Ligand binder design. Structure first.
Ligand SMILES: [Mg+2]
Ligand SMILES: [Zn+2]
Ligand SMILES: [Zn+2]
Lengths: 83, 82, 1343, 99
DNA sequence: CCACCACGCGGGCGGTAGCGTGCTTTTTTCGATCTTCC
DNA sequence: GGAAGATCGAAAAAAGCACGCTACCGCCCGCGTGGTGG
RNA sequence: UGGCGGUAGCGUGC
């Protein structure tokens, strides 16, 4: 459901880090069993990640912060369970 | 040895005329007491002593069981030189 | 896992450590039982078991016995793959030298031992003895002794001297030398020596010795003693039908070597005489050399059917070698190939894919989805279901390729556009459907073309295809920036037919309320498509703040234009579609839509344009008929009068008034004029001769002829093609190149007799042969250019450099080839641009020049702009984003990390097929424009009549318009009379300067009497009587026939005053003595009064296409180089030898160390009493690029190369941006020769990479130590590629033997740091998406 | 002609060539240059290693696709190892320095 | 006593010698002058 | 006034000759030497 | 179902 990535390219502004962040997000959905922040009209994982990048929901710094927060809640919970 | 054919000195030819005393060492040794490798049967990968040259088309070898060694006639090509 | 690759020669201990056993027998595999023999070339004990976890004897055949060596047969129980890694070793009876280090020039052994290669070959192959221990006798250390000499030496002093024979002597010599002491002696000798050749040889040997001692390698290891043996799987035995086995050449060579070694050992045991053992050792050495590299020396070992055997080095290098067949390129899975058809219903991002091909390619994805859905519980069930092809399988296949891109590629991938990503659409058939608009990008015609499709199969690759290689993202050509998505044949014709106006078409004069009413009228068959009506339409204009404002107005247009207007987006104005709308107009409209609206509406607009064009071309029903090509009624009269003129010229020649050449030229000119008139009459009768009855009377209009319709609109054909169809075919040339007197006066519509067809076949055959022999040359040039710029990437944003090229518009003759706007478009200035005459900044220092900046520059009338250049980039190991400029494929600035050298090389090499390799076939200045005249580098003097004559040999005349912009430029020859002075406005068609091209008249800047001095008839001159006038004119005799007594009496005419002594030059103490060169003709007699500017004496006076480009890029020295003045100073002649003269340049303030040998037959532009500066032309001929670089600097040679390449490409009509040529030039300039060693450790004669020298100089300056002066060098593309830091790229390029020998001897350590190295290794390249990864590794290496 | 997976050469461990042998299309040097110009580093790496030469990479990638995971392991192409062994057989010691 | 089948060990081929023969560019070496001096 | 550096042209040797694909043919040592059978 | 050599053909400014 996507033909041109020019808007996504100018949102990222590098056209090369966009591919990396989109691949990371697509792997997060497909392998990590995550959920998309936008509705999917029978869209592939890469197209879903690109569409999420289009509206600014997903960004490299945003993705890093979200991953760090997830890791923090994860091992805080595991430490609480162990203790 | 180069463009022109090599010319041996006459001393080398004179020496080689009477040099030959017949040489004992041979590439293949059918002499008794020489270890010989077997490559067939349960004896494959094992060495056996030579008994003596008996016959012309083939020679007999002393097969080596763990208990003791015993002679037996084998084909000349059956055994290999070790 | 690893960071670098280390290459060095292998010591015997290391070779023994590599091997797991010793090969002693040549047997490979028993024929009766397919098992290898013990100690053979395929022995299981040495290498490994033939089956996985199975002993050869069979005692252990399970995984439980892993790692234990059997005792029955001694073969380890492990995997069969270990047989691909374990190597063997052969213990040679006698040492044998390595052929690579012996024959590959320069010989490493000979260079190390300072002895000729012939002596090395003589000793190696047992021809002459070599001394090792000289002792106290007259014999030295390394002396060549023959058989009789050695016998005599051992006869007289046969006590202590040692002389050995064969490779053993060379090994002993190598082992018995001290590297440090020899290096010290060599350095001292180089310091004390003065000969240039001796200095170069000493420097080379010193560098070799330092490289050898620095590394851990030893010279004695260059003589092989243990021979490595490849793993058996790398030399497999193919099992053939009938029991036969296919044996590779490596096995045969190994068997030969083993047999020779065994024979030598047996003969040594038997104590054979000296000659027999020497012959055996020589034969063993020959066999070893053949195995290592067959064919290098002597007769190559032949094969079964008389072919050379493939040795170890034969399969490493070359096109069929490992590097170019299995590393640079390789066959891949998930790929298919099929013919390509045209699908008009497809979109720009969609391509048709057959169902069978899609099912075959996406098999693993279908298997995975089937397993996930639960339909198949195992892989076998999924395979069976896919084979049976049920409906569920088709549904799964449709689901899995919803948005999975596929890479479609054509075989001749000249540039990056040859492979593009498309979204697959399932079709039934066996042919791939391609979007028409991308066909021009693919250079593909639907006449049997076959294309390949690859399936990306990971998230990263899928996203890269979607974002980078998608067809919707590739709309601008990176080579020049021009759009690539343009209608070609049918869309253009349909749009031209729709957007055309008739005179009395049905429904003309109506008034319509909008485009919808126009379409509803056309569909109902109530109004013609060409009817002229008035329609009320609303157009949207983009506001300044970015909004759209709607203006409604009544426009007089046609029905077709109104219908087409609806598909046009809102932002575009109506003026674009209110014309005939030819191919150029359509391209301009698409470019305007992309510039204004953007990229997202552009693809939709292009798709709608293609759909409408196809539909209306189908509706028009244009057709070609025999009546469409009309023959002019005046052709017969023109032909008759031309024939009459030719006949009268022939009869005049037969009467003897004119010669053969004059009559031939007259006939050629007459026939050319007749052909031109015939073509003009044809065009006049075809384009507008149609007549139409309007509403009341008759009138004329543009023709509706089909042929003219497709010729004028640009859909197909051209003016020459229509001329060949309807007019005469014109003159034809024979294969040699000359033109034929009788042209082809027959149209293609009419019949051509046998003679005309036979004549015309020559050109077609020549063109076809040229293309056939040109394809390979273009491919080779493209490959060389790609390699020479394979490791250039953008690794920085800005260097802060204050340097750049001063780009100006190019002018040649009486026209401007290229305006400054396109030359400077998409580039950043190197300094502030000042308004002329106001000293006010116009453009900031570091602002990119887009369209608005170029418009400001052109409205302000600025011609010279200083812009940053790639060749001037201060960044080392790559270039910066700023110093490169615009991307030229995207609107924004260039990105960081992507590869620009590959793009530049592809852009340069793609138009190679346009060029042609085969080569076939003034006295005044003409002014074409009205403007002022400016003279540059002009030292002029008034003549007797007041005219101006220039005394400078490099004077330029520039015609400048009233706006101050240099319009035209010419190079006025020295000593040309000027009709008008400088700073005077002149009109077009006027002549300003005149000169004699046949002879050069000597010009005098002083007034007085010429006397006959310092010259005597019969010795230095001859008083020859003129043939016609009979006057005794003096002719200067050359030094060849000059008498010995008069040799020192150089002829020289002196201008004298009334006193009689020579008149001093104004402002010069040295008196005016015009030296007389050879073959000088003087007509004036003794004591002739002349004034300034008078004529004293008369002095009598290429390739193109691919070869020219190759010569320019190879830095080939022209065979007639132009001598240049290296140092600024006065000119003098010291002495003269036979065939050469000693020209001396004496600077006024500098010293005089220069003595140039000038050949006798080379014409000298300068005389004895002139003054020249640095980089001044001394003799006629092309300028060698090396001389330009050495004298005039880097910028001059860069500009020269860029201008030459651009002119060559423009001659063929191909436009290429100068960025690519600048990148190639920068890649050429990568090495520098040191002049002063300074504090750095670099040798005086060393040639070092420019980046290394710059870094060392920067470090020394930071530490306070003095730097090292360097001079840059220019090398050819192949020379630059071969001489690079990374030996892997040079080895993979070509001449792998020499590169590998250099790397092994020097012990070079290679870091990847490039594209080809990473490709060969198999890691992410440092260009593009991988760049951000690689930098991370670098920072990971930081800590 | 089309191919997803099949027989491989017994020397270079690369897919065969030709329709008769059910081989795969060859990605020549020009295609590699085009991919480098495009900047698609990941596509070039996956087409160079995990599709043709890396046996363990090929098996792991096939298993991952069957398992629905689109991830790869670059590994090490076998052609480079073959070249290293051949150069070692020439008497020249070439090795990969990890440091 | 002669003819067909298997098995191991060298190597240009065959012959009482000679076989070749329609490219271009770059690099190396060598005889021959030369030339320049100490 | 002979020996060493210059050079100079002429000759000899090495390396290269676009990319994909299709089909067919031929070949994948071989020859002496011993074994054995008719 | 493994490769070499030879031959011919296909797509490569219309
Ligand atoms: Mg075609
Ligand atoms: Zn075993
Ligand atoms: Zn820069």
């Amino acid at each position: 459901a996507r033909v041109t990535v020019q808007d996504a390219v100018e949102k990222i502004g590098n056209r090369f880090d966009l591919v990396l962040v989109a691949a990371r997000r697509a792997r997060q959905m497909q392998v990590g069993g995550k959920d998309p922040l936008v509705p999917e009209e029978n869209d592939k994982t890469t197209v879903i990640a690109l569409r999420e990048i289009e509206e600014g929901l997903i960004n490299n710094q945003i993705l890093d912060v979200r991953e760090r927060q997830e890791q923090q809640e994860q091992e805080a919970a595991e430490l609480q369970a162990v203790t | 040895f180069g463009a022109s054919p090599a010319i041996v000195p006459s001393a080398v030819i004179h020496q080689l005329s009477v040099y030959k005393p017949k040489d004992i060492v041979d590439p293949a040794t059918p002499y008794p007491g020489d270890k010989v490798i077997i490559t067939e049967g349960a004896f494959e990968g094992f060495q056996a002593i030579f008994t003596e040259p008996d016959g012309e088309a083939r020679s007999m070898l002393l097969l080596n069981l763990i208990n003791k060694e015993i002679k037996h006639s084998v084909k000349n090509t059956e055994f290999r030189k070790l | 896992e690893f960071d670098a690759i280390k290459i060095a020669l292998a010591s015997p201990d290391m070779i023994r450590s590599w091997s797991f056993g010793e090969v002693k027998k040549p047997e490979t595999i028993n024929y009766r039982t397919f098992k290898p023999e013990r100690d053979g070339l395929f022995c299981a004990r040495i290498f490994g078991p033939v089956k996985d976890y199975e002993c050869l004897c069979g005692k252990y055949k399970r995984l439980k016995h892993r790692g234990v060596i059997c005792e029955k047969c001694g073969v380890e129980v492990t995997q069969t793959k270990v047989r691909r890694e374990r190597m063997g070793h052969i213990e040679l009876a006698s040492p044998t030298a390595h052929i690579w280090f012996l024959k590959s020039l320069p010989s490493r052994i000979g260079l190390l031992l300072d002895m000729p290669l012939r002596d090395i070959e003589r000793v190696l192959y047992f021809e002459s003895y070599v001394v090792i221990e000289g002792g106290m006798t007259n014999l030295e250390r390394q002396q060549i002794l023959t058989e009789e000499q050695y016998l005599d030496a051992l006869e007289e002093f046969g006590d202590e001297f040692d002389a050995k024979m064969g490779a053993e002597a060379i090994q002993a010599l190598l082992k018995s030398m001290d590297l440090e002491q020899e290096c010290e002696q060599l350095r001292e000798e180089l310091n004390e020596t003065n000969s240039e050749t001796k200095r170069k040889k000493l420097t080379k040997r010193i560098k070799l010795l330092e490289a050898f001692v620095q590394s851990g390698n030893k010279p004695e290891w260059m003589i092989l003693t243990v021979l490595p043996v490849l793993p058996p799987d790398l030399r497999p035995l193919v099992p053939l039908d009938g029991g036969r086995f296919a044996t590779s050449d490596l096995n045969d060579l190994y068997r030969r070597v083993i047999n020779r070694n065994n024979r030598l050992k047996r003969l040594l045991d038997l104590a054979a005489p000296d000659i027999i053992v020497r012959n055996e050792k020589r034969m063993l050495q020959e066999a070893v050399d053949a195995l290592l590299d067959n064919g290098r020396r002597g007769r190559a070992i032949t094969g079964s059917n008389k072919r050379p055997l493939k040795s170890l080095a034969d399969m490493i290098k070359g096109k069929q070698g490992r590097f170019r067949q299995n590393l640079l390129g390789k066959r891949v899975d998930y790929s298919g190939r099929s013919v390509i058809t045209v699908g008009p219903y497809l979109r720009l991002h969609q391509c048709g894919l057959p169902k069978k091909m899609a099912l075959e390619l996406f098999k693993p994805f279908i298997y995975g989805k089937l397993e996930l859905r639960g339909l198949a519980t195992t892989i076998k069930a999924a395979k069976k279901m896919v084979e049976r092809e049920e409906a569920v399988v088709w549904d799964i296949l449709d689901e899995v390729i919803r948005e999975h891109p596929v890479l479609l590629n054509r075989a001749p991938t000249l540039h990056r556009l040859g492979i593009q990503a498309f979204e697959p659409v399932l079709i039934e058939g066996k042919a791939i459907q391609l979007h028409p608009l991308v066909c021009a990008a693919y250079n593909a015609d639907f006449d049997g073309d076959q294309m390949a499709v690859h399936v990306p199969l990971t998230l990263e690759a899928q996203l890269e295809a979607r974002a980078l290689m998608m067809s919707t993202n590739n709309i601008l050509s990176p080579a020049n920036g021009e759009p690539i998505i343009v209608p070609s044949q049918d869309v253009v014709l349909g749009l031209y037919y729709m957007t055309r106006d008739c005179v009395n078409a049905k429904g003309e004069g109506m008034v319509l309320t909008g485009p919808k009413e126009a379409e509803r009228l056309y569909r109902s068959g109530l109004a013609s498509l060409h009817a002229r009506v008035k329609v009320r339409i609303t157009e949207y204009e983009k506001d300044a703040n970015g909004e759209l404002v709607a203006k409604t107005s009544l426009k007089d247009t046609t029905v077709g234009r109104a219908i087409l207007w609806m598909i046009v987006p809102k932002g575009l104005p109506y003026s674009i579609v209110n014309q005939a709308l030819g191919k150029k107009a359509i391209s301009k409209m698409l470019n305007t839509c992309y510039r204004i609206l953007g990229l997202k509406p552009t693809v939709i607009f292009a798709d709608q344009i293609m759909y409408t064009g196809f539909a209306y071309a189908a509706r028009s029903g244009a057709s070609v008929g025999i009546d469409d090509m009309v023959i002019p009624e005046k052709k017969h009269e023109i032909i008759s009068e031309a024939e009459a003129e030719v006949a009268e010229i022939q009869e005049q020649f037969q009467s003897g008034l004119v010669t053969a050449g004059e009559r031939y030229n007259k006939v050629i000119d007459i026939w050319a004029a007749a052909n031109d008139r015939v073509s003009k009459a044809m065009m006049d009768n075809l384009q507008t001769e149609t007549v139409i009855n309007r509403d009341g009377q008759e009138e004329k209009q543009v023709s509706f002829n089909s042929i003219y319709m497709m010729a004028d609109s640009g859909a197909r054909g051209s003016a020459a093609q229509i001329r060949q169809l309807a007019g005469m075919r014109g003159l034809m040339a024979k294969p040699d190149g000359s033109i034929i007197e009788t042209p082809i006066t027959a149209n293609f519509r009419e019949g051509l007799n046998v003679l005309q067809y036979f004549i015309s076949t020559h050109g077609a055959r020549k063109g076809l042969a040229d293309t056939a022999l040109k394809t390979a040359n273009s491919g080779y040039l493209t490959r060389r250019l790609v390699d020479v710029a394979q490791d250039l990437v953008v690794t920085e944003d800005d260097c802060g450099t204050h340097e750049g090229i001063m780009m100006t518009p190019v002018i040649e003759g009486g026209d401007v080839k290229e305006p400054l706007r396109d030359r400077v478009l998409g580039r950043v200035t190197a300094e502030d641009v000042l308004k002329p005459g106001t000293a006010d900044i116009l453009v900031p220092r570091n602002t990119l020049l887009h369209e608005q900046w170029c418009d400001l520059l052109e409205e302000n009338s600025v011609d010279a702009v200083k812009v940053r250049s790639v060749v001037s980039c201060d960044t080392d190991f790559g270039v910066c984003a700023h110093c490169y400029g615009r991307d030229l494929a995207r609107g924004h600035i260039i990105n960081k990390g992507e590869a620009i050298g590959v793009i530049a090389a592809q852009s340069i090499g793609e138009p190679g097929t346009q060029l042609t390799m085969r080569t076939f076939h003034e006295s005044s200045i003409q002014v074409k424009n009205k403007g002022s005249i400016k003279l540059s580098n002009v030292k002029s003097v008034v003549n007797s009549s007041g005219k101006l004559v220039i005394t400078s040999r490099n004077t330029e005349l520039k015609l400048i318009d009233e706006f101050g912009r240099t319009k035209e430029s010419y190079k006025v020859p020295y000593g040309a009379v000027l009709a008008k002075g400088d700073g005077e406005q002149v009109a077009g068609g006027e002549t300003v300067a005149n000169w004699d091209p046949h002879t050069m008249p000597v010009i005098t800047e002083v007034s007085g009497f010429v006397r006959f001095t310092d010259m005597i008839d019969g010795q230095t001159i001859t008083r020859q009587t003129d043939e016609l006038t009979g006057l005794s004119s003096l002719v200067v005799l050359d030094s060849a026939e000059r008498t010995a007594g008069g040799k020192d009496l150089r002829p020289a005419l002196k201008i004298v005053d009334a006193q009689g002594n020579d008149v001093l030059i104004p402002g010069t103490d040295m008196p005016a003595q015009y030296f007389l060169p050879g073959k000088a003709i003087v007509q004036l007699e003794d004591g002739v009064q002349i004034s300034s500017g008078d004529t004293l004496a008369r002095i009598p006076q290429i390739t193109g296409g691919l070869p020219r480009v190759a010569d320019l890029f190879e830095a080939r020295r022209p065979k007639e180089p132009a001598i240049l003045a290296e140092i600024s100073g006065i000119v003098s002649f010291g002495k003269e030898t036979k065939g050469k003269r000693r020209l001396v340049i004496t600077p006024v303030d500098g010293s005089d160390p220069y003595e140039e040998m000038i050949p006798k037959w080379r014409q000298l532009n300068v005389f004895e009493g002139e003054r020249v500066e640095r980089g001044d032309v001394i003799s006629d001929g092309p300028e060698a690029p090396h001389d330009i670089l050495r004298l005039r600097g880097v910028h001059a040679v860069t500009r020269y190369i860029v201008n030459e390449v651009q002119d060559v490409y423009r001659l063929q009509g191909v436009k290429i941006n100068d960025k690519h040529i600048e990148v190639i030039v920068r890649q050429m300039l990568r090495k520098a020769t040191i002049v002063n060693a300074g504090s750095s450790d670099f040798l005086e004669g060393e040639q070092v990479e420019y980046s290394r020298v710059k870094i060392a100089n920067r470090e020394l300056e930071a530490n306070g130590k003095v730097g090292a002066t360097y001079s840059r060098d220019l090398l050819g593309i192949t020379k630059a590629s071969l001489a690079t830091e990374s030996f892997i790229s040079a080895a993979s390029f070509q001449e792998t033997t020499r590169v590998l020998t250099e790397a092994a001897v020097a012990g070079k350590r290679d870091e990847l740091r490039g594209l080809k190295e990473n490709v060969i290794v198999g890691r992410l390249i440092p260009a593009g998406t991988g760049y951000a990864y690689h930098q991370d590794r670098m920072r990971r290496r930081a800590a | 002609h089309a191919r997803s997976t099949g027989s491989y050469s017994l020397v270079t461990q690369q897919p065969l060539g030709g329709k008769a042998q059910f081989g795969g299309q060859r990605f020549g040097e020009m295609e590699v240059w085009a991919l480098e110009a495009y900047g698609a580093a990941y596509t070039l790496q996956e087409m160079l290693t995990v599709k043709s030469d890396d046996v363990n990479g090929r098996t792991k990638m096939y298993k991952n696709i069957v398992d629905g995971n689109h991830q790869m392991e670059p590994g090490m192409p076998e052609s480079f190892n073959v070249l290293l062994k051949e150069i070692r057989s020439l008497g020249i010691n070439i090795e990969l320095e990890d440091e």
